[PDB]
Design a protein around this motif. Structure first.
Motif, PDB file in Angstrom:
ATOM      1  N   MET B 331       0.831  -1.194   0.000  1.00 29.17           N
ATOM      2  CA  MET B 331       0.000   0.000   0.000  1.00 29.17           C
ATOM      3  C   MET B 331       0.870   1.250   0.000  1.00 29.17           C
ATOM      4  O   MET B 331       1.940   1.278   0.608  1.00 29.17           O
ATOM      5  CB  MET B 331      -0.951  -0.001   1.199  1.00 29.17           C
ATOM      6  CG  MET B 331      -0.265   0.009   2.554  1.00 29.17           C
ATOM      7  SD  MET B 331      -1.402  -0.732   3.954  1.00 29.17           S
ATOM      8  CE  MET B 331      -1.433  -2.585   3.350  1.00 29.17           C
ATOM      9  N   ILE B 365      -3.784   4.779   0.014  1.00 33.13           N
ATOM     10  CA  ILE B 365      -4.598   4.949   1.207  1.00 33.13           C
ATOM     11  C   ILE B 365      -4.268   6.283   1.853  1.00 33.13           C
ATOM     12  O   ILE B 365      -3.155   6.799   1.716  1.00 33.13           O
ATOM     13  CB  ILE B 365      -4.317   3.796   2.192  1.00 33.13           C
ATOM     14  CG1 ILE B 365      -2.823   3.745   2.499  1.00 33.13           C
ATOM     15  CG2 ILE B 365      -4.686   2.464   1.588  1.00 33.13           C
ATOM     16  CD1 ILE B 365      -2.482   2.916   3.699  1.00 33.13           C
ATOM     17  N   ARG B 369      -5.416   5.258   7.760  1.00 34.97           N
ATOM     18  CA  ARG B 369      -5.939   3.908   7.582  1.00 34.97           C
ATOM     19  C   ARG B 369      -4.896   2.800   7.692  1.00 34.97           C
ATOM     20  O   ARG B 369      -5.283   1.625   7.747  1.00 34.97           O
ATOM     21  CB  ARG B 369      -6.643   3.787   6.224  1.00 34.97           C
ATOM     22  CG  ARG B 369      -8.038   4.393   6.158  1.00 34.97           C
ATOM     23  CD  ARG B 369      -8.476   4.659   4.718  1.00 34.97           C
ATOM     24  NE  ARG B 369      -8.501   3.457   3.879  1.00 34.97           N
ATOM     25  CZ  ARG B 369      -9.344   2.434   4.004  1.00 34.97           C
ATOM     26  NH1 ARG B 369     -10.266   2.423   4.954  1.00 34.97           N
ATOM     27  NH2 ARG B 369      -9.250   1.408   3.164  1.00 34.97           N
ATOM     28  N   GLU B 373      -5.434  -1.332   7.629  1.00 35.37           N
ATOM     29  CA  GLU B 373      -5.253  -2.172   6.448  1.00 35.37           C
ATOM     30  C   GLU B 373      -4.143  -3.175   6.682  1.00 35.37           C
ATOM     31  O   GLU B 373      -4.293  -4.363   6.352  1.00 35.37           O
ATOM     32  CB  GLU B 373      -4.969  -1.303   5.222  1.00 35.37           C
ATOM     33  CG  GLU B 373      -6.143  -0.425   4.777  1.00 35.37           C
ATOM     34  CD  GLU B 373      -7.350  -1.212   4.264  1.00 35.37           C
ATOM     35  OE1 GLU B 373      -7.728  -2.244   4.859  1.00 35.37           O
ATOM     36  OE2 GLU B 373      -7.934  -0.789   3.245  1.00 35.37           O
TER      37      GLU B 373
END
Lengths: 496, 398, 483
Positions: B331, B365, B369, B373
């Motif tokens: 991410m 993201i 978050r 995640e």
């Protein structure tokens, strides 16, 4: 576009082949020759057996000038009759730059080599990453690198550096088993001279920063440097002649001309060790007495000259030789020699090549330099390599055998299958100058000999030096069916 | 026991350690060795060496099988260094411990160097320069406590599972999470403390740091997410702008291989501008030594989650747990700059969206978050099975 | 820019990628009575459990996501992977970015060993990408083949599915279509009629594949029912071929019940009168309930999943209400693949047998009843899961051999007193003395002769007794089953 008629498409294919090879080669030859360099295809032609090359992906193109092959020539062939895979960068076509098409071609021949279990030779000569393809370039570098890691110890991997090799281009050679450079046309570094001189305060040339001599003598990244491209390619073929195609299949066995009885070459070892302990000898004269035809291929000849790593044969079988060399730093072990021999030994173990050790080790090189740069965790790599290995191990103790050095150099407790000592072997906890935690001549008389070790069975035999060749050949032949179990783990945690 | 026969290595002594190591290999439990020795028992001659070698051999055959921890609580010279060097963690204690292959008497008599034991191989030397020491305790209580805390993250062996603990993560978004939306400075020459991100994600904001004083441009630590052991490798821009170099590469490389051996997932926090330039790094072999971290990531099969907080250029991005090197979930924050280079352009390419367009990243993201995640990814990956090349072992560069 | 401005910029593209794209997609799909890709993902998965991957992937008009929504989530608490075509974006067509997203979800599911649900609604290959589209079709197909019998694979067809789009659904284990909104064919009605005049629904509408071709294991009345069907199905299955199937608590009566006693009268007195085999099955299974596979295909045989004492059971049963329960090509291929699937995922097989023989005819012989009916023999003999067989009535020749007889590998075979276990029927052998199970019992070919009321009770015991069964398998890459 294509023609419609069958004959015209055959002719059209001949035209595109003409453009992609014959034309592209003429022109590459012009640009490379003015820099003293051969073309990608000339190097492939010198490396492979005549007529054996099958070129793959000849008409691959990138996806947005779109030359055929995208700047790399890939395929497979044979070297002295055994199959190998090959790639060769074309520096003259889009800089031999790493793109998605380029990279996919190299990925395919790597997949093929892993699939059939044959060696891979990479011929490197690249301007680096293809910047216009953005991160795509990085992805393929990583893909190739990942295959190297998954091929490590599965198929032999050899890197020829025959041009510029900077940035991401260094990644795959770094992961292969042998990197061979060439005298004046190659160099190697992660970060280049201009940016080193721009962020760091150092004005340096490409050759001073990462020329062949630097990596052959200082960094150890280069296992051999050829005088010219021919010499390097020849070195690579000779090396492959010692290796199996993969870690399952047997190494080649050759016919031999070994004398069954004592020769004058054998009798010469009875006098090779000087009377005085000040005087040294050349271990190579011992090594050549034992190996077929007195010949061996030396790995890292100019790096850590205090130890010798080489491939030779006994009775036609591949044998790896690790030997202390008293002609440089009195044959002591240090960081460089330990990492040199350690990786050599682990490689030979992966591909089932037995290890013949010639020991004459007085200890370790002592200084602040060695301790602060990590002789503990880096010298221990050679201990790890010996203890981990399961190949047959034969050890010949010619002279000094002191403490941890003796432990590391293929002692019986570290896993050697046969250990023989000459009467010049001095197997002791330490030298007689160091044993005054409790006259040094007296200690030298009691303990400067192999018979305490022989009394405990730590060595198996004490022989006259002239018998060495003979006994090594016997031990080797007796050990070819050796089976040794290995710890159950994904992998070990060797010190790095 | 240093006071009894100098705590020196002999056949009886050595056989006792051999017996306990054989037992631990036999039942698959960790071994902690507490070292404090005058060295080889010279009156026993080569016998002492033999037993050193025996112990070493067992260390090698236990490597990646059972956790092995070495506490250095005194002199440790000569043969004494061999077994600690082969274990997974070496913990020293200041004022009372030192390590060197060759002692100062011989250094001076052979090399003309006058140095004390503490300058030659004192705890600071091995914690900061050589990297032989993974932790140095202020006193013995602190080193022992460190070792026990370390064991609390680890499985007993390479087959049985790591311990799982009771938990207290807030189920929803907290202010600690929302603080990550502000941690990346607006100005790009301004740095931040990567530790604030790491502590935002891990249970109790806590971790046990490996090699804290060595190669501080990279962080290696053990922490937990929802009570499960997770290993953290993260560039630290507070030291050398988070650049990679020889020391950081070898530090993280071995940490990753050890965690892979004992099935601990690896969570990477990436913010790497590249490698440290210089004659020093190239001639000391950054090619073959820096590549060790690439080997460690690519070889590893444990779950790998990577969070790209900012800089992600070229080879540094490749190595730091990219998807192409084997990461299972990657991410990126909107501050992530995933590109071949930086400025060797900044408006169109200083962002995560080209990598996102190619699927080289799985996710962009808002930072608040991340903790959430990451937790999801970790939980989704616990049944991961991945095949390994068939070989006795690899041939990693050394 | 600025850090806060990049967070805001990301919020803008996220809303662009999902919310605005969703309202346009919902509009254009409601105009054909269909829901959105994301709407269906939301009906399928547990609320809030969806983690979307590759949200900003774009091809090389460039919409985010390239026309498929990919990610993973949970169904009734257990992890599953999902992809869902969006037909409104670039036709939901197969391109390299699209393809890479589904490849990634498939790689993940193979990596962690969890099921994959694909929701299909596609315009076909993206022609503008040339061979690239085919390449990616192939990649996906190959993963299905390498997942086959490793992780459950379920295909939802909720729109057009033609040409290359049929390849991956064909390789999954269960294909579910929806009434009126889905169709399937290799070649479309245009060209089909250009060599023949047919519409999409008659060429490959749901009814065709549910009753004629057998490509559809279930057809939902609307999307919600098809999705519910898939969730109910996953509730019976393991996550993969290694980890155990779910076990639920039950309230089974410990002793004989009246429901048990009703089976004593279920077989009619005269042998031309048929019964409903479903009443027997419901008497044996928990809650009298089962999930039927291929309900409208080859209805002379029943294949279903149910539970006994909370454990998953697969049921294969001759149905005399259709073709007197004879075996034929369709029934053999249906039951055969069901059994092989259950064997791959360690689900025991419960057989209810009442088979008079095979359907005779030039039709059956010329279309290959030999090589296709034999597939069911292969499935039974190959399987190693526990196999329990209850013989209610007709037990003639090869038909009896095939449905889980003991010599084909069944572990426990019980027979009712109405079981007629014989080499052939009365008419063909030229019977009061042979219309019974006792020569089979005398030879030990059946293990017990029971009054029907005992069935459930013995079945459950047999099942519980066999959970630790292990059976060796031939050493081979794979067999050579007839195709």
């Amino acid at each position: 576009e294509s023609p419609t008629s069958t004959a015209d498409r055959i002719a059209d294919l001949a035209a595109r082949h003409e453009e992609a090879v014959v034309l592209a080669e003429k022109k590459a030859a012009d640009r490379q020759h003015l820099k003293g360099k051969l073309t990608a295809r000339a190097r492939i032609d010198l490396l492979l057996d005549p007529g054996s090359f099958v070129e793959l992906d000849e008409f691959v193109r990138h996806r947005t000038p779109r030359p055929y092959g995208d700047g790399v020539v890939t395929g497979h062939g044979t070297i002295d009759g055994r199959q190998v895979c090959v790639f060769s960068h074309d520096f003259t076509t889009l800089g031999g730059s790493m793109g998605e098409a380029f990279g996919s071609k190299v990925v395919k021949i790597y997949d093929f080599a892993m699939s059939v279990g044959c060696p891979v030779i990479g011929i490197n000569d690249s301007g680096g990453a293809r910047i216009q393809e953005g991160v795509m370039s990085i992805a393929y570098y990583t893909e190739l690198g990942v295959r190297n890691v998954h091929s490590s110890g599965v198929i032999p991997q050899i890197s020829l550096i025959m041009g510029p090799c900077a940035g991401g281009s260094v990644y795959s050679p770094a992961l292969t088993d042998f990197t061979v450079m060439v005298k004046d046309i190659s160099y190697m570094f992660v970060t280049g001279p201009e940016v080193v001189s721009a962020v760091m305060g150092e004005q340096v040339t490409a050759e001073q920063l990462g020329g062949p001599a630097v990596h052959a003598e200082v960094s150890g990244n280069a296992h051999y440097v050829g005088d010219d491209e021919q010499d390097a390619i020849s070195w690579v073929q000779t090396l492959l002649g010692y290796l199996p195609p993969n870690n399952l299949d047997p190494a080649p066995v050759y016919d031999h001309d070994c004398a069954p009885g004592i020769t004058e070459a054998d009798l010469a070892l009875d006098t090779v060790i000087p009377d005085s302990e000040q005087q040294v000898y050349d271990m190579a004269d011992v090594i050549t007495a034992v190996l077929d035809d007195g010949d061996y291929l030396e790995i890292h000849p100019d790096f850590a000259r205090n130890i010798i790593c080489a491939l030779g044969r006994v009775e036609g079988h591949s044998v790896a030789v690790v030997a202390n060399q008293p002609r440089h730093l009195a044959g002591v072990l240090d960081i460089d020699a330990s990492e040199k021999a350690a990786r050599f030994i682990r490689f030979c173990d992966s591909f089932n090549i037995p290890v013949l050790t010639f020991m004459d080790v007085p200890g370790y090189l002592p200084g602040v330099g060695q301790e602060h740069q990590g002789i503990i965790r880096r010298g221990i790599k050679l201990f790890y390599a010996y203890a981990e290995s399961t190949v047959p191990k034969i050890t010949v103790i010619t002279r000094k055998a002191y403490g941890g050095g003796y432990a590391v150099m293929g002692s019986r407790q570290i896993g050697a299958d046969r250990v023989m000592a000459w009467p010049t072997a001095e197997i002791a906890v330490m030298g007689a100058n160091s044993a005054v935690p409790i006259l040094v001549d007296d200690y030298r008389r009691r303990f400067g000999n192999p018979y305490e070790a022989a009394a405990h069975g730590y060595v198996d035999m004490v022989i006259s030096p002239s018998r060495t060749r003979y006994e090594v050949a016997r031990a080797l032949a007796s050990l070819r069916n050796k089976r040794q179990a290995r710890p159950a783990r994904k992998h070990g945690n060797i010190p790095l």
